[PDB]
């Protein structure tokens, strides 16, 4: 109900009751401890699904990877009691992440023998069985990508009295594609607004008209952004959207900036990504008529340590459209090197 | 941005960065000081309006009238010092409200005098004359409705909310019909969502594909609801919105209900009104086929003071729509008496 609400801008104390939006991306690791609903049923579901030819599962966000790594071998211990000749493995995430054509079913009955829910199962770690099951990772050679499910878990409830929130997740009963909304949120106040998610932070300001100010990214999802949690959903050109529609971008007039278009060849291969409208460290940008056309993004720093001190583009509004990542600094697609061929420059990975 | 919170029913608590809202409807108009620009400059404003032929001013909300009532006599003191025969008279507001076809001008010069208006050592006094610059009220005789300006101010700062409470207001420089977004707010989270302002509060629930849950109203504002501070602004029909666009109703699929249409002929004469989906005491509603038509809203209590029991309607869905205010209980337009279609009941006049 009540909140501290210390306004840094004018040092104001302010109290009442209403709705609260929190920035939780910066500290994702320690806020969660997931678990299925009665793993006795999850084991049966995974066993039944494998019989239909499904090979593995591709994660949708780092949260699911953390959950799978946490449960890890515990599944084999329970499976052993029923004599299941199957083994499950857990991999690792990579940027970006693709979809999964298939989906998981829901069992009609649970295991016939075995009444274990939770407990002593921490004291077992077995070896391979006659069959193998894989999840994420560098396992492109085991089974093709077209044999795995994707985005099949719902969020029944969020938040609990442990601080390792015992969020209950289970398989969806229906067929759907949109990103899970139970954790999404957004709000607007005065001359500021932001759309929030577990791994997304987008800020908008009103200087002149609604536009982009800053954004923080930890992962690239590929699920449709729910429209019913968006601001100003009127018709807008898909080109102008800075965040591509494919990368779970919001469908809002806020999500745009005049003079720039969709960025489908951005450095999505980077582990961590932040979008800021400031030039790369020590570099500079200009708007020029005779510059090159749209093309793959170029890193401002060469693999040999050489930096590029010239850039240009025609329709851009000066000076930056910059990306920030652990590996260095990049630029938007519209920007091109002024007097350097792309052959002698570190071309950004083209995942478009 | 930095604050704390405690969940309504859950035990979750924290103090982290984010964006927060609280209701400001039932606080009943906290005692703010309201610096309408420098009163020295504002004195030159009304001079041109009266000189050009503006006689009266209508109100847009129950906040401008309070500012006028706060400043009052000091305005007459300025003209008394400068020697101009004019004054102001203030009434009370009645609902519904009506818009005006005029707007105030912007002076380019300051009144030549030693400003003794604001910060002076008390001693503010004046007398009454016949040159009445009536604001608000039923005094149409001195100034007809079509000669009154409306919504000719603009917010500049909402700070000092702790101790000084001096929201800065200044006359706008350009013509427009939209409201002032500087105080408007709206947010959504998970299974709940609500739109709020200084005089409205609407709650929408995620029970099944969104539907109106409950709302609170204190003044029947008729300003133009902004589109840049609302969710899901496309894919709706104006015939379904519970609050018609003329009444500043938000344009959103959230702002609707299944089995009901607009309520342009509702009981908009009360002072404070709350929308609740529940049968009024004693009374009940039956969904039948042989009911009447979409007539003007009818009061739930006869003029003699006794309640009317039986009603009917076709497109309704339990619970029925209802309006509740101090005067009593009112039902929806689609809901008419069942057995007797007689008009021997208190009825609301045509509104549009």
């Amino acid at each position: 109900d009540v909140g501290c609400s210390v306004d840094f801008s004018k040092k104001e104390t302010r109290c009442g009751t209403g709705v609260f939006i929190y920035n939780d991306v910066e500290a994702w690791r320690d806020r969660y401890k997931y678990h299925p609903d009665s793993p006795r049923r999850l084991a049966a579901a995974v066993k039944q699904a494998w019989e239909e030819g499904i090979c593995g599962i591709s994660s949708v966000s780092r949260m699911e990877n953390i959950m799978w790594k946490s449960v890890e071998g515990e599944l084999n211990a329970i499976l052993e009691e029923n004599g299941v000749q199957l083994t499950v493995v857990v991999g690792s995430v990579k940027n970006p992440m693709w979809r999964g054509p298939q989906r998981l079913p829901v069992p009609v009955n649970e295991l016939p023998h075995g009444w274990k829910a939770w407990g002593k199962s921490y004291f077992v770690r077995a070896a391979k069985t006659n069959n193998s099951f894989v999840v994420d990772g560098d396992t492109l050679k085991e089974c093709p990508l077209e044999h795995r499910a994707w985005n099949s878990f719902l969020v029944e409830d969020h938040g609990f009295g442990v601080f390792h929130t015992s969020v209950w997740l289970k398989v969806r009963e229906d067929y759907s594609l949109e990103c899970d909304p139970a954790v999404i949120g957004t709000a607007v106040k005065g001359r500021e607004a932001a759309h929030s998610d577990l791994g997304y932070w987008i800020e908008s300001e009103k200087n002149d008209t609604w536009r982009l100010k800053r954004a923080h990214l930890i992962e690239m999802k590929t699920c449709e952004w729910p429209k019913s949690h968006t601001l100003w959903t009127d018709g807008v050109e898909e080109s102008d959207l800075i965040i591509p529609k494919s990368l779970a971008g919001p469908l809002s007039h806020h999500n745009t900036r005049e003079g720039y278009r969709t960025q489908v060849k951005g450095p999505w291969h980077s582990e961590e990504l932040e979008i800021r409208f400031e030039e790369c460290p020590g570099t500079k940008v200009y708007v020029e008529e005779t510059c090159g056309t749209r093309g793959p993004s170029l890193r401002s720093t060469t693999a040999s340590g050489r930096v590029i001190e010239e850039w240009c583009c025609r329709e851009c509004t000066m000076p930056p459209l910059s990306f920030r990542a652990k590996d260095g600094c990049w630029y938007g697609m519209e920007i091109r090197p002024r007097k350097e061929p792309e052959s002698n420059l570190v071309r950004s990975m083209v995942t478009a | 941005d930095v604050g704390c919170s405690v969940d309504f029913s859950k035990k979750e608590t924290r103090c982290g960065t984010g964006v927060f809202i609280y209701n400001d409807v039932e606080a009943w108009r906290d005692r703010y000081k309201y610096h309408p620009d420098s009163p020295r400059r504002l004195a030159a404003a009304v001079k041109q309006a009266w000189e050009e032929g503006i006689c009266g001013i209508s109100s847009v909300s129950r906040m401008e009238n309070i500012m006028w009532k706060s400043v009052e006599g000091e305005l007459n003191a300025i003209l008394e010092e400068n020697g101009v025969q004019l004054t102001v008279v203030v009434g009370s507001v009645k609902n519904p409200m009506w818009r005006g076809p005029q707007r105030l001008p912007v002076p380019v010069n300051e009144l030549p005098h030693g400003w003794k208006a604001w910060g002076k050592s008390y001693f503010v006094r004046a007398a009454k004359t016949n040159n009445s610059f009536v604001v608000d009220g039923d005094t149409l005789k001195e100034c007809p409705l079509e000669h009154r300006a409306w919504n000719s101010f603009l917010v500049e700062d909402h700070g000092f909310g702790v101790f000084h409470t001096s929201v800065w207001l200044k006359v706008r420089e350009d013509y427009s019909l939209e409201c002032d977004p500087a105080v408007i707010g709206t947010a959504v989270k998970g299974r709940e969502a609500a739109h709020s302002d200084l005089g409205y509060w609407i709650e929408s629930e995620k029970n099944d594909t969104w539907r109106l849950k409950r709302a609170h109203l204190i003044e029947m504002k008729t300003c133009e609801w902004p589109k840049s501070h609302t969710l899901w602004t496309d894919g709706v029909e104006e015939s379904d919105l519970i609050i018609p666009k003329s009444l500043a109703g938000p344009l959103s699929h959230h702002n609707t209900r299944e089995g009901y249409r607009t309520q342009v002929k509702g009981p908009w004469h009360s002072e404070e009104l709350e929308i609740r989906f529940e049968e009024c005491p004693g009374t009940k509603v039956y969904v039948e086929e042989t009911c009447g038509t979409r007539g003007p809203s009818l009061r739930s209590t006869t003029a003699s003071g006794r309640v009317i029991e039986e009603w009917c309607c076709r497109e309704c869905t339990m619970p029925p729509l209802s309006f509740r205010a101090k005067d009593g209980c009112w039902y929806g337009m689609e809901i008419r008496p069942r057995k007797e279609p007689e008009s021997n009941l208190v009825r609301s006049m045509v509104t549009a």
Partner: antibody
Amino acid sequence: SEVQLVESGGGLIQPGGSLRLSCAASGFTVSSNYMSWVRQAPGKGLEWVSVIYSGGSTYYADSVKGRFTISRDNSKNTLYLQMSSLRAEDTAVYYCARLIAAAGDYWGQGTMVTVSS
Amino acid sequence: SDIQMTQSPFTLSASVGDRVTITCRASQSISSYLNWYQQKPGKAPKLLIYAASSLQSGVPSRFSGSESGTDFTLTISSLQPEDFATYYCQQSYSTPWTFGQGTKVEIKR
């Protein structure tokens, strides 16, 4: 009961008019799935008109955006479609296609719509 | 436009027991969101292969399909007299969703 699909509402309308189309169903629930309209021009291939999500979202193709309207009555498990500003070029046979790209599709008998003076 | 769907060749001829292959190509990588539709004249269309790799329960499994980067294919191990109809290529990745031009199989004489 088993799945049955039946279209209706077709006929002969004058140019510039408006008409409604419906697609009833039995068994499964239309509220929790995806539905779309498919039309086949005379002697041509199929074509996709619009799609409605189970969550209430909709998207329209370029040829018809800004002229149609679709909604479903979940109380009795029925789907309705509306169109405005008709023209001769729109004459075709329309189906309410159960376009589920993974599980499967059930298709009805279709209905004929004609525009001519 | 976002996605274009192309079918080639337009029509082919064969006989009973012959092996026939149909190809379908897209303009960019859109994963395996793709299905084929079979249409008999005077009857409603039907779906035979879903997810570009699996066949529905029904007529015996004499149908096949695969993918390699950006190309798709449909093949019949042995033609039967009831297999002379029209086939279509369709995708459901990103809006707007398009359809293929179609292909026909006819008796050879």
